[PDB]
Design an enzyme around this catalytic site. Structure first.
Site, PDB file in Angstrom:
ATOM      1  N   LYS B 154      56.507  29.151 -54.215  1.00 59.81           N
ATOM      2  CA  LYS B 154      57.883  29.103 -54.699  1.00 59.81           C
ATOM      3  C   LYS B 154      58.914  29.358 -53.626  1.00 59.81           C
ATOM      4  O   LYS B 154      59.689  28.464 -53.278  1.00 59.81           O
ATOM      5  CB  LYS B 154      58.065  30.124 -55.792  1.00 59.81           C
ATOM      6  CG  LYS B 154      57.113  29.917 -56.920  1.00 59.81           C
ATOM      7  CD  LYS B 154      57.396  30.868 -58.041  1.00 59.81           C
ATOM      8  CE  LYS B 154      57.001  32.276 -57.641  1.00 59.81           C
ATOM      9  NZ  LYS B 154      55.572  32.395 -57.258  1.00 59.81           N
ATOM     10  N   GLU B 180      63.150  39.609 -57.158  1.00 61.81           N
ATOM     11  CA  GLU B 180      62.200  39.329 -56.085  1.00 61.81           C
ATOM     12  C   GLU B 180      62.140  40.413 -54.986  1.00 61.81           C
ATOM     13  O   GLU B 180      62.446  41.590 -55.261  1.00 61.81           O
ATOM     14  CB  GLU B 180      62.484  37.942 -55.519  1.00 61.81           C
ATOM     15  CG  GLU B 180      61.817  36.864 -56.353  1.00 61.81           C
ATOM     16  CD  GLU B 180      60.288  37.019 -56.362  1.00 61.81           C
ATOM     17  OE1 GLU B 180      59.682  36.906 -55.262  1.00 61.81           O
ATOM     18  OE2 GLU B 180      59.696  37.261 -57.452  1.00 61.81           O
ATOM     19  N   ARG B 181      61.741  40.056 -53.765  1.00 61.19           N
ATOM     20  CA  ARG B 181      61.645  41.079 -52.703  1.00 61.19           C
ATOM     21  C   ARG B 181      62.945  41.348 -51.964  1.00 61.19           C
ATOM     22  O   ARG B 181      63.551  40.438 -51.384  1.00 61.19           O
ATOM     23  CB  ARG B 181      60.572  40.710 -51.661  1.00 61.19           C
ATOM     24  CG  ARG B 181      59.157  40.615 -52.203  1.00 61.19           C
ATOM     25  CD  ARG B 181      58.111  40.351 -51.125  1.00 61.19           C
ATOM     26  NE  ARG B 181      56.796  40.167 -51.738  1.00 61.19           N
ATOM     27  CZ  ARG B 181      56.483  39.150 -52.535  1.00 61.19           C
ATOM     28  NH1 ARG B 181      57.376  38.217 -52.800  1.00 61.19           N
ATOM     29  NH2 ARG B 181      55.300  39.092 -53.116  1.00 61.19           N
TER      30      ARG B 181
HETATM   31  N1  LIG Z   1      54.684  25.306 -47.373  1.00 61.98           N
HETATM   32  C1  LIG Z   1      53.795  26.215 -46.991  1.00 61.98           C
HETATM   33  N2  LIG Z   1      53.125  26.054 -45.785  1.00 61.98           N
HETATM   34  C2  LIG Z   1      52.208  27.005 -45.408  1.00 61.98           C
HETATM   35  N3  LIG Z   1      51.868  28.101 -46.062  1.00 61.98           N
HETATM   36  C3  LIG Z   1      52.557  28.222 -47.250  1.00 61.98           C
HETATM   37  C4  LIG Z   1      53.499  27.350 -47.765  1.00 61.98           C
HETATM   38  N4  LIG Z   1      53.980  27.776 -48.973  1.00 61.98           N
HETATM   39  C5  LIG Z   1      53.319  28.918 -49.175  1.00 61.98           C
HETATM   40  N5  LIG Z   1      52.461  29.241 -48.180  1.00 61.98           N
HETATM   41  C6  LIG Z   1      51.580  30.393 -48.025  1.00 61.98           C
HETATM   42  O1  LIG Z   1      51.627  31.305 -49.115  1.00 61.98           O
HETATM   43  C7  LIG Z   1      52.295  32.523 -48.679  1.00 61.98           C
HETATM   44  C8  LIG Z   1      53.367  33.080 -49.521  1.00 61.98           C
HETATM   45  O2  LIG Z   1      54.100  32.126 -50.281  1.00 61.98           O
HETATM   46  P1  LIG Z   1      55.517  32.388 -50.893  1.00 61.98           P
HETATM   47  O3  LIG Z   1      56.581  31.456 -50.503  1.00 61.98           O
HETATM   48  O4  LIG Z   1      56.009  33.773 -50.621  1.00 61.98           O
HETATM   49  O5  LIG Z   1      55.077  32.339 -52.414  1.00 61.98           O
HETATM   50  P2  LIG Z   1      55.844  32.775 -53.709  1.00 61.98           P
HETATM   51  O6  LIG Z   1      55.799  31.673 -54.630  1.00 61.98           O
HETATM   52  O7  LIG Z   1      57.268  33.125 -53.441  1.00 61.98           O
HETATM   53  N6  LIG Z   1      55.031  34.013 -54.406  1.00 61.98           N
HETATM   54  P3  LIG Z   1      55.584  35.393 -54.915  1.00 61.98           P
HETATM   55  O8  LIG Z   1      56.992  35.598 -54.633  1.00 61.98           O
HETATM   56  O9  LIG Z   1      54.710  36.494 -54.356  1.00 61.98           O
HETATM   57  O10 LIG Z   1      55.374  35.328 -56.405  1.00 61.98           O
HETATM   58  C9  LIG Z   1      52.757  32.305 -47.258  1.00 61.98           C
HETATM   59  O11 LIG Z   1      52.534  33.454 -46.519  1.00 61.98           O
HETATM   60  C10 LIG Z   1      51.886  31.224 -46.766  1.00 61.98           C
HETATM   61  O12 LIG Z   1      50.722  31.703 -46.176  1.00 61.98           O
HETATM   62 MG   LIG Z   2      58.746  34.478 -54.247  1.00 61.11          MG
END
Ligand SMILES: Nc1ncnc2c1ncn2[C@@H]1O[C@H](COP(=O)(O)OP(=O)(O)NP(=O)(O)O)[C@@H](O)[C@H]1O
Ligand SMILES: [Mg+2]
Ligand SMILES: Nc1ncnc2c1ncn2[C@@H]1O[C@H](COP(=O)(O)OP(=O)(O)NP(=O)(O)O)[C@@H](O)[C@H]1O
Ligand SMILES: [Mg+2]
Lengths: 159, 466, 94, 479, 128, 466, 128
Positions: B154, B180-181
Site C-alpha cells: 500500500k 499509520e506510522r
Molecule cells: N514496489 C515495491 N518494490 C519492492 N518492495 C516492495 C514494494 N512494495 C512493497 N515492498 C516490500 O514490502 C515492504 C513494506 O511495504 P509497505 O509499503 O510498507 O506496505 P504497506 O502496505 O504500507 N503495509 P502496512 O502499512 O504495514 O500495513 C517493503 O519494505 C518492501 O520490502
Molecule cells: Mg502502510
C-alpha cells in the site's frame, strides 16, 4: 444443519435430493446412497426386492471408489472386471432417472409410471450383465426396462 | 452554559448539561486542561446528558469537571495557508511552525454533494505503472482504492503515485495520514520539503498535510479522515481546482470507529464491528468526490486485517471505489511487486469506448491467459507440467512472462529491488503485452521480463543472460 | 474458505495422495514424466521416470494436505469462535 | 471522606467497583488496604471501576480505597540498570530499594512527526544474518516473529549481549542501554535469563521488567508500557536504548482477558477492537530523535509468536503493520539445523539500510543478491555456480548462541563468501572453516579489524589486506 | 401501481445485501437481539415480503404484472452464505455470474451450470 | 462468621454474610448435610453477598440454609501419611482406610515461589530410563508432556518413574487424577499396589494419590490439580525433596476451567475456552519449578483437541513444557518397551550448555541414525536390501542395535515379566550408545541389546545366545 | 435396582445428544450462561454423573452391574464437536459406525480401526 438433522428421526422413509445429482441432469435428483426407508427389510419386501436394492447401492458405492482412481489414471487401467462395473454403474445410475408427468413442461418428454415389479426386474437384469451391449443413454429418462432397449434400438437405427 | 463530566470510559465521556444541551456533532471543550481536549457529541442519552467521544486522551479527567459547548462542530482552517503545514484532527498545527492564520474555517462534518452535483466524466489518469495503467487504469477525478495486507505494498504504492502523479500535477494536493506510522509522516514530510512540494520559506507549497497516526486515541483516528477530507473540500469548492487527496489508510477510520462503538452502548455487528460501519463510512466516502464545482482524484490505501478481503471493513469499501488495486501477499511472496492481483483489481474506466479497443483487447488478453494459467495450477501442483498438453505448456509459459512483465521497479523501492526506478508509458505497456501474447517473445527466458520497464528492457536483459 | 469446502479438498487430495503412492511402488516393481514427451517431440527409463513422477506427486499432495489441514483447524477454530460470539450477543441483548 | 477515598462495593471478574473517590482522575493510581495498587479505568455516576495491578482476590467489599492523586507512572532512571523489577517498578531481585529519583507516566504519548529523523545509527545485533540481510537502525522497530521454540528470544539476547563491546567504551553516543520486558513467560526462564545476562556482564546496562505467567493479567497488560517509559528516559536525554517486549502475543491474550472480562464485544479471534491500538501506541514510542531534540533514540524489537507459521493471523499482522520489518524465524529451518533460522526471503528491514554500516553494505549488498539468484534456482555451468555460492553463504549465516560477533569480523567472514574463497571448499566444512578463520583473523589481525571497526568501511587499503588474510589461510586449512 | 392497471412494470432491487445491511443496522440500534452474522431474526421475511409482491395478475385484476430482478452480492463466491441462500430460496431461479468466466472472456459471465429459470419454456416466443 | 445461602443455580451458590465477609478463594462449609459440601469463594457481589462454586452436588440446598466461613481456603492433610492414601478434592480420604492422621494442613491456593526463590541452574532429572535420559531428558522442576493414549505402557512408565526417582533421588510422588474415570482410577490403585509403589501394610509407599472423578462437578475437577499440587509442595518445601507430580490429563483441568468460567457467566474467549485460560494455567503451572529447598518435576498427560496442536488448550500448555514423552503403538507392536518414540519425544534442555557437549553429540547421533534408517525403509523393501553400500549396510544394522537398546525392562514389570528390572545411570546410557555408534559392538547379534540394562548386559547376553 | 441386588443390567440411552438438546433449552430459557454451541457450562457434569452411575460392583456389594450404552449422533462425523467430545471422554470406549462402510456392504457398519474398547480382552473368554 439443526433444522433438517432434527427432522430425520421423525420420518419412516427419507428421499434425499442432491444438487450433485441434479447437476448430472438426473431427476428426480434422489441420492441413492443417502435415501433410506424403514421397510427396506427383506422380510417386508421379500429377498428379491431387497438384494437388488443393496446390489444397486453397492455397485454405486464401488463406482464412487473408482471415481477417484480413474480421476488420475484414466479409463484404461481398471482391470476388465472393474471397468465393467463402472460401465454398469453409469447405466444403473441413469436408469434411476425418470420423466414425471408433472415435469413434462420441463423435460419435454412424456411422463412414465413404473410398476414395482417392472422396476426390480429392470435393475435385476442390468446387474446381471444382460444389457452390457446397450449404450448408457438408452437407460436415461425412461419407464420400464423395455423402453430402454427400444430407445437403444431407436438409437442404433439413427446412427 | 456549563456542562459537567458525569462518566469516563476510555474515550467515551458522558457530559451532563443543566441548561442548553449541545446538539449532536457539537464540539465541547473540556475545561481545566493543559492542552485543548475536544469531545464530540455523539448522542443524547436523555436526562440532559450527552455521550461524547474524546479527540485526545482522557487521562486525568474527573467527574464533575466542566465542559464547554463551542456551539459548533470541530472547525479547522481551510485555505492556502494550510498548504505546507501539518495539522491534527482538530486543525491545530503540529509542525512547530506556529498558528495557521487562515481567513475561513470549516466544520469537519458536512453533507455530501447532492445527486445533481454528481460528475459523470471519465478520463483516464495514466500512472506509469504497467499493471494499473493496463488492467485497471486510474481515473482523473476518480476514487482509487489500494487494498493490501500488513506489509504488502500500500504505502510504497501511494508514495510512487505521489511521485509519478502528484509532482506532474497542476494544483493542490492533500495527504491525510490516518492511523499509520508516525515516522512515516516524518519520512513524507522530509521527502516533500526535499522535492520542494513543501516550502518553508517562500509560499509556493502545494501540499496540505493532516495527520492522526496509530499513536492517537480512537476518537482522533476516527475523525482525522474527515479533517483531511474537509481541507480537500475547500480547495475543490471554494476555489474550483483539481484536488488530489491521498489518504494512507482509511481502514483506520473504521477500525477506530469500532473501538469507541463498543463504549457508546451499541450492540455489536458482525465480527465485532459497529452497526453503523456502512453508514458511518458512507457519510464520509460520499464527501470524497468530484462535483460539477470541481474535481478530486482520491487515492486511498486500504488495510485488510488478517489478509481477509471479506472482512466487513474492506468488503464494505469496494462499492465506494471507481478503481481498485488489490495487493496480494502470495504474489508479493513470489517477489512480484507491485503485488497487484491481475484478476481482482478493477476500473470502471476499463471500457473499450473509453480506453480504446486495442487497450481493452490486450487487457482482456492478459486477464484471460493468467486466468487460464490459474485454473491449471491445480494440475501443476500434483502432476507437474509433463501432464499438460502442448497447448497448455504454451499458455503457462506466456502467463509466467506476463506475470513477471507485470512487475516493475518503483523509484520509492530501489533499496529493496536493487534496480533503478522505471516509469512506463501507456502505449509502451499496451505494446509490450500485445507482443508477449502474440508469442513474439516465446523464445526469451522468464527471468528476462522480471523487474523491468518497457518490453525493450525485457530483451536487453535476455542477451545479458545469454 | 468454508469448512465444507476444505473438508472436500482434503478428502479428495488425501485420496489422490493414496493412489499416487501406490503407483510409485508398482512402477518401482516394474504417466511417465517427460519420457514419452522427449522422444515424441524429437523400459528402464520409463519405470525410472514413473517411479520419480509418482514419488514427487506423492510428496506434492502430502505437502498440500499438510497445508489444507492447518487451514482446516484455523478455520475450524474460527467457526466455533464465530458461533459463540453470535450466541452471546443475543444473550447480552436481552 | 468520599472525595479522596472510597469503599469497595464489589470485587469479582477482575475489576473492583469502588464507591466514592469523587475526585479521582481517569487512569489514576489508587491504593487499597492490603497495600495492593490499582488504576481508575471507568468513572461512572455511582462508582469507579478499578483495574487491579495484582491479585484481586485480596480485595474485599468494604475495603478503603485512597487516591494517590496521580495518573499511573513508574520509577525511571539509570539507577534501574542491572536491576529486576515488576511491572510497577518494584525491584524483585532481593538487592534492595531502587535509587530512582524521577518518575514517568507509562501512558505518555509518543513523539510526533517533527522531533524525528530516519534511523541512521547501527543497531548491531552481532548476528551475521541480521546485521547483514536485515540491518536494524537505532530508533527503528523490528518485529521478531516465529513459532514457539524457533530462536526468537536468542535474536534478542545475543543482541543485548552484543552491546557490551560498546558500553565498555568512552563515547556515550555508541553505547546502548538495554531493556528486556518479560511478558507471560515463566519466572524460571527470566531467572535463567538474567543469570545468563549476568555472566555475559550485560545486566549492568540492562533493565528487566517482569510480568510472568503467575502475574494477574493487568500486570502483564502493563509491563511493556512501564519498560517503555524507562527506555524513553534514555531516548529523550540523548542516550540510546533498546527495549525488547518478549512477545506481545502474551500481552495481547492478557489484555483479551480483561476485555472479555469487562464484557467488551469479542471480535476476530475473540480479541477486543483495540488490540491494535494496544500495540501501536506502545510501539510508536520507540523512535529516533533528531539533533534538535537530543539525538537519542529507542529501538524496539517486539516478539510475536505465530501458530504453525501463520503470519496472516490477526495479531501477527497487526504488529507487522506497526513495526518497520519482521525477522521471520521458520520452524522447518530450525529443526533442520539452520540457526539462526531466519527466513531471509520473508524478513525485512524497511528502515535499517541507511543505518547499516558502509562496511556491510559493500559485501552484504552483493550477498542479498547472490542469495536472491540462489533462492530462485533452488546442470549448466551458469546456475551450478549459483547453487554453490548459495549453500556456502547459507552456512555462513549459521551462528551459535550467546556469542555475538563484532561488525568488523562479520564483514571479514562474509567478505570470504562473497568474493568466492569458499567455492572450492565443501559445505560440511564451511562452518569448521569459519570458526577457524575467524579465530585466526581476531588473533593475528587486530589492525585490519580495528581499521574496519574504526572506518566502519572496508577501504581499498583494508580490502587488499583482507584478501591476503583469507587466501593465505585456505592454504593452511585442514579439511 | 402499474401492476394494478393493466400495465407491466419491471423492478430492479440493486442490492438486497446492502438493504439487509441497513436493516441490520437499524434493528441493532432499536435494541432487538442480533443473530446469524448479526442480522435480525426476520431478515428472511425482509426479502420474502418484498419479492412476493412481484406477480402476474389475472384479467379480473387487470392482467398486469411486476417482475423483479433483485441483485445479490456474495463474498469469495459463496452462494452458500446466509442472505444469499435466504433470497435464492425465495426467487423462482437465479442467474449466477462468476469472476472465473469473466476473465476467460465469457462476458456476460453467466455460468449456465448454476443458472436456472423455474419458468423455462413458459417464458419464450415461438421462433427463439 | 455464619452466612445464609441466598442463591443456588447449579454448581453456583451465592451466600450472604451479615457481618464478616469471607475473602475470595475462602472455603465455606455448608451446614446440614450428610457428606461435607464445600463452597469455594469466587466473587464479592456486594451487599454482604458472595458467590461461590460448590465442590460437590447442590441438591438439597435451601435458601437460608446456614453456611460457615472456614477462615481460609480449602485446606488438606499434608505430610508423609498421605502417601499410599487416595485423597479427595477437599482432603478427605476416599480409600476408606479411615482418617489421614496428619499434624499438618495446607491451603490449596498458594502463590508461586518468588523470583529470588528461583533456581538459575539447569539440571537434568535422571530417570534411569535410557530413551528418556538420552533423547528427551526430564528437566528437574520442569513439565513434560506425556503423549500417548492407552495400551502403550502409560501406567507402567508412570510407576516405574515413581520407583526410579524414589530409588535414585529419595523424592516421593503424587498423582493428581484430574477428571479421572472412577473405573481406571480403581484399576490404577490396585495396579500400583501389585507393583510395590503402594503398600497397604508397611509404610513403604512412594506415591500419594489425589483424584478428581468425572462425576465430580467442574468446580471439583478444577481444583484437584491444586490439591494434589499442595501435597507435593509439602515434600519440596518441608523435606527438601525432588518430588514428581503426575497430572493425568492436564487438558481436563483446562476444560474443567472453562466450565467453571461459563457457570460463572464469563464471556468465553476464542474457541470457547475461558478468558483466564493462560492465567488459570499460569497460577498452577508456575508452582512447579526448582526452589532453593528442592524441586518438583511433573509429568502431565496431554490431550490434543481435534488433533490440532494450535487449539488453545494445548498451545497454552506447550508454553509450560520442557519435554515431551511420546508413546507409540507403532513402537509397542515391535515389542519395544517402553514404547517411547525416539524421534517424536524431545527436550528444550537437550542443549550442550545444559546436558554437556558429550551427552549432546550422543543423543544427536542416535537421532540421526534413526532418521537415516527410517528413510532407507523404502529402498530396502522395493529396490531390495542387496545394493546397500558399506555405509548403507552398517547404518541399518547399527540403527537396529540402537533402536532395540532403547528398550528397557522395568522393575515394576518384574511381577509379570519375570525379569529383574533395570535402572540405568546417565553415565552408562551415554557410553552405551556412544560406543554402538562407533562400531565397537558391531560383532554382536541384535537380540543382545534387546531388553537389557547397562551396555555390559548386552555383550553378556550375546555370548550366552552365542 | 438390579445393580444393587446382585443382578446385572444393560441400559441403553438412545442419543444423549437429544437429552443435551433438552437440557440446553431449559438452561437458555431460564437464562443461565450459554457456552460453546449455546450449551450450559455444566452439560458435561450432566453426562458424567449419569455415565459413572454404571459399574461392575464388588462381590461384597452383591456382584451386580449396570452396563451402559449411550448413543451419540454426530454431524458429518465431526466427533471433535462439543457433546461428542464430552461423552467420548466420559465413557470407556467407542464402536464407530459409518455410511460408506454401509452402502458398501459392510454391515453392521463398524470401523474396526476407529472403534475401541479400553477393556479389551478382559471381557473376552479365551475361546474368543
Ligand atoms: N514496489 C515495491 N518494490 C519492492 N518492495 C516492495 C514494494 N512494495 C512493497 N515492498 C516490500 O514490502 C515492504 C513494506 O511495504 P509497505 O509499503 O510498507 O506496505 P504497506 O502496505 O504500507 N503495509 P502496512 O502499512 O504495514 O500495513 C517493503 O519494505 C518492501 O520490502
Ligand atoms: Mg502502510
Ligand atoms: N543461534 C542459535 N544457535 C543454536 N541453538 C540456538 C540458537 N538460538 C536458539 N537456540 C536453541 O533453541 C532453544 C530455544 O530458543 P529460544 O531462544 O527460546 O527460541 P524462542 O523462539 O524464543 N522460543 P520460546 O521462547 O521457547 O517460545 C535454546 O534452548 C537453544 O538451544
Ligand atoms: Mg521466546
Amino acid at each position: 444443519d439443526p433444522a433438517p438433522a432434527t427432522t430425520f428421526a421423525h420420518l419412516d422413509a427419507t428421499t434425499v435430493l442432491s444438487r450433485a445429482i441434479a447437476e448430472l441432469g438426473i431427476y428426480p435428483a434422489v441420492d441413492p446412497l443417502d435415501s433410506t426407508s424403514r421397510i427396506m427389510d427383506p422380510n417386508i419386501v421379500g429377498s428379491e426386492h431387497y438384494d437388488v436394492a443393496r446390489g444397486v447401492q453397492k455397485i454405486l458405492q464401488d463406482y464412487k471408489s473408482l471415481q477417484d482412481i480413474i480421476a488420475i489414471l484414466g479409463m484404461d487401467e481398471l482391470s476388465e472386471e472393474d471397468k465393467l462395473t463402472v460401465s454398469r454403474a453409469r447405466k444403473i445410475q441413469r436408469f434411476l432417472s425418470q420423466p414425471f408427468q408433472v415435469a413434462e413442461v420441463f423435460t419435454g418428454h412424456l411422463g412414465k409410471l413404473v410398476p414395482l415389479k417392472e422396476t426390480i426386474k429392470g435393475f435385476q437384469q442390468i446387474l446381471a450383465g444382460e444389457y452390457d451391449h446397450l449404450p448408457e443413454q438408452a437407460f436415461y429418462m425412461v419407464g420400464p426396462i423395455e423402453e430402454a432397449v427400444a430407445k437403444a434400438d431407436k438409437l442404433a437405427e439413427e446412427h | 452554559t456549563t456542562g459537567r463530566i458525569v462518566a469516563v470510559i476510555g474515550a467515551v465521556v458522558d457530559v451532563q448539561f443543566d441548561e442548553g444541551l449541545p446538539p449532536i456533532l457539537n464540539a465541547l471543550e473540556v475545561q481545566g486542561r493543559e492542552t485543548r481536549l475536544v469531545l464530540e457529541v455523539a448522542q443524547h442519552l436523555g436526562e440532559s446528558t450527552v455521550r461524547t467521544i474524546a479527540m485526545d486522551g482522557t487521562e486525568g479527567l474527573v467527574r464533575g469537571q466542566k465542559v464547554l459547548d463551542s456551539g459548533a462542530p470541530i472547525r479547522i482552517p481551510v485555505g492556502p495557508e494550510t498548504l505546507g503545514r501539518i495539522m491534527n484532527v482538530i486543525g491545530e498545527p503540529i509542525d512547530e511552525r506556529g498558528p495557521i492564520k487562515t481567513k475561513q474555517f470549516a466544520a469537519i462534518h458536512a453533507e455530501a454533494p447532492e445527486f445533481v452535483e454528481m460528475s459523470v466524466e471519465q478520463e483516464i489518469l495514466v500512472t506509469g505503472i504497467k499493471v494499473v495503467d493496463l488492467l485497471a487504469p486510474y481515473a482523473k477525478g476518480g476514487k482509487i482504492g489500494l487494498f493490501g495486507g500488513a506489509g504488502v505494498g500500500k504505502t510504497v504504492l501511494i508514495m510512487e503515485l505521489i511521485n509519478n502523479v502528484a509532482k506532474a500535477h497542476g494544483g493542490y494536493s492533500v495527504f491525510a495520514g490516518v492511523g499509520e506510522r508516525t515516522r512515516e509522516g516524518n519520512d513524507l514530510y522530509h521527502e516533500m520539503i526535499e522535492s520542494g512540494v513543501i516550502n518553508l520559506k517562500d509560499a509556493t507549497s502545494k501540499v496540505a498535510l493532516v495527520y492522526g497516526q496509530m499513536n492517537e486515541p480512537p476518537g482522533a483516528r476516527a475523525r482525522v479522515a474527515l479533517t483531511g477530507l474537509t481541507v480537500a473540500e475547500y480547495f475543490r469548492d471554494q476555489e474550483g481546482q483539481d484536488v488530489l487527496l491521498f489518504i494512507d489508510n482509511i481502514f483506520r477510520f473504521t477500525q477506530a470507529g469500532s473501538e469507541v462503538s463498543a463504549l457508546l452502548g451499541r450492540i455489536p455487528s458482525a465480527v465485532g464491528y459497529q452497526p453503523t460501519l456502512a453508514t458511518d463510512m458512507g457519510t464520509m466516502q460520499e464527501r470524497i468526490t468530484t462535483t460539477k464545482k470541481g474535481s478530486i482524484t482520491s487515492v486511498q490505501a486500504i488495510y485488510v486485517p488478517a489478509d481477509d478481503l471479506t472482512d466487513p471493513a474492506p468488503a464494505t469499501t469496494f462499492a465506494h471505489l471507481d478503481a481498485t488495486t488489490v495487493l496480494s501477499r502470495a504474489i508479493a511472496e513470489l517477489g512480484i511487486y507491485p503485488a497487484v492481483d491481475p484478476l481482482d483489481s478493477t476500473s470502471r474506466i476499463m471500457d473499450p469506448n473509453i480506453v480504446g479497443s486495442e487497450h481493452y483487447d490486450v487487457a482482456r488478453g492478459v486477464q484471460k491467459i493468467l486466468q487460464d494459467y490459474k485454473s491449471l495450477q491445480d494440475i501443476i501442483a500434483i502432476l507437474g507440467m509433463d501432464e499438460l498438453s502442448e497447448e497448455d505448456k504454451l499458455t503457462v509459459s506466456r502467463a509466467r512472462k506476463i506475470q513477471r512483465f507485470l512487475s516493475q521497479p518503483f523509484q520509492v523501492a530501489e533499496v529493496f529491488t536493487g534496480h533503478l526506478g522505471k516509469l512506463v508509458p501507456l502505449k509502451e505497456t499496451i505494446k509490450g503485452f500485445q507482443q508477449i501474447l502474440a508469442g513474439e517473445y516465446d523464445h526469451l527466458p522468464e527471468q528476462a521480463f522480471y523487474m523491468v520497464g518497457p518490453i525493450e528492457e525485457a530483451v536487453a536483459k535476455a542477451d545479458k543472460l545469454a | 474458505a468454508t469448512l465444507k469446502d476444505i473438508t472436500r479438498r482434503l478428502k479428495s487430495i488425501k485420496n489422490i495422495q493414496k493412489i499416487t503412492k501406490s503407483m510409485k511402488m508398482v512402477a518401482a516393481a516394474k504417466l511417465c514424466g517427460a519420457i514419452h514427451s522427449s522422444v515424441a517431440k524429437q523400459t528402464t527409463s520409463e519405470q525410472s521416470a514413473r517411479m520419480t513422477a509418482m514419488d514427487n506427486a506423492s510428496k506434492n499432495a502430502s505437502e498440500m494436505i499438510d497445508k489444507l489441514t492447518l487451514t482446516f483447524n484455523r478455520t475450524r477454530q474460527a467457526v466455533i469462535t464465530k458461533e459463540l460470539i453470535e450466541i452471546i450477543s443475543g444473550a447480552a441483548a436481552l | 471522606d468520599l472525595e479522596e477515598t472510597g469503599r469497595v462495593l464489589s470485587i469479582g471478574d477482575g475489576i473492583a467497583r469502588v464507591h466514592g473517590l469523587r475526585n479521582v482522575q481517569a487512569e489514576e493510581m489508587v491504593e487499597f488496604s492490603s497495600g495492593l495498587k490499582g488504576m481508575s479505568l471507568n468513572l461512572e455516576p455511582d462508582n469507579v471501576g478499578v483495574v487491579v495491578f495484582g491479585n484481586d482476590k485480596l480485595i474485599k467489599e468494604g475495603d478503603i480505597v485512597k487516591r494517590t492523586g496521580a495518573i499511573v507512572d513508574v520509577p525511571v532512571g539509570e539507577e534501574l540498570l542491572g536491576r529486576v523489577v515488576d511491572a510497577l517498578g518494584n525491584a524483585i531481585d532481593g538487592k534492595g530499594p531502587i535509587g530512582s529519583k524521577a518518575r514517568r507516566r507509562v501512558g505518555l504519548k509518543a513523539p510526533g512527526i517533527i522531533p524525528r529523523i530516519s534511523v541512521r545509527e547501527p543497531m548491531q545485533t552481532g548476528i551475521k544474518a541480521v546485521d547483514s540481510l536485515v540491518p536494524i537502525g537505532r530508533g527503528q522497530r523490528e518485529l521478531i516473529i516465529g513459532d514457539r521454540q524457533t530462536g526468537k528470544t536468542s535474536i534478542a539476547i545475543d543482541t543485548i549481549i552484543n552491546q557490551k563491546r560498546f558500553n565498555d567504551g568512552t563515547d556515550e553516543k555508541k553505547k546502548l542501554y538495554c531493556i528486556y520486558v518479560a511478558i507471560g513467560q515463566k519466572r524460571s526462564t527470566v531467572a535463567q535469563l538474567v543469570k545468563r545476562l549476568t555472566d555475559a556482564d550485560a545486566m549492568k546496562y540492562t533493565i528487566v521488567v517482569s510480568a510472568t505467567a503467575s502475574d494477574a493479567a493487568p500486570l502483564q497488560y502493563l509491563a511493556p508500557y512501564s519498560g517503555c517509559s524507562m527506555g524513553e528516559y534514555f531516548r529523550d536525554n540523548g542516550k540510546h536504548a533498546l527495549i525488547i517486549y518478549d512477545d506481545l502475543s502474551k500481552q495481547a491474550v492478557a489484555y483479551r482477558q480483561m476485555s472479555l472480562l469487562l464484557r467488551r464485544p469479542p471480535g476476530r479471534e475473540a480479541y477486543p477492537g483495540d488490540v491494535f491500538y494496544l500495540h501501536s501506541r506502545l510501539l510508536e514510542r520507540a523512535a529516533k530523535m533528531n539533533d534538535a531534540f537530543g539525538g537519542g533514540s529507542l529501538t524496539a524489537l517486539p516478539v510475536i509468536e505465530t501458530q504453525a507459521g501463520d503470519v496472516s493471523a490477526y495479531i501477527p499482522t497487526n504488529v507487522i503493520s506497526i513495526t518497520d520489518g519482521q525477522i521471520f524465524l521458520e520452524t522447518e529451518l530450525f529443526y533442520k539445523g539452520i540457526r539462526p533460522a531466519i527466513n531471509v526471503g520473508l524478513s525485512v528491514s524497511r528502515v535499517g539500510s541507511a543505518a547499516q554500516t558502509r562496511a556491510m553494505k559493500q559485501v552484504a549488498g552483493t550477498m542479498k543478491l547472490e542469495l536472491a539468484q540462489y533462492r530462485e534456482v533452488a546442470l549448466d555451468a551458469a546456475t551450478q555456480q549459483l547453487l554453490s555460492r548459495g549453500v556456502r553463504l547459507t552456512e555462513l549465516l549459521k551462528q551459535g548462541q550467546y556469542s555475538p560477533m563484532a561488525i568488523e569480523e562479520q564483514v571479514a567472514v562474509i567478505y570470504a563468501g562473497v568474493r568466492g574463497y569458499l567455492d572450492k571448499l565443501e559445505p560440511s566444512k564451511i562452518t569448521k572453516f569459519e570458526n577457524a578463520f575467524l579465530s585466526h583473523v581476531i588473533s593475528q589481525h587486530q589492525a585490519l579489524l580495528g581499521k574496519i571497526r574504526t572506518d566502519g568501511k572496508i577501504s581499498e587499503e583494508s580490502d587488499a589486506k583482507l584478501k591476503e588474510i583469507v587466501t593465505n589461510f585456505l592454504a593452511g586449512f585442514e579439511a
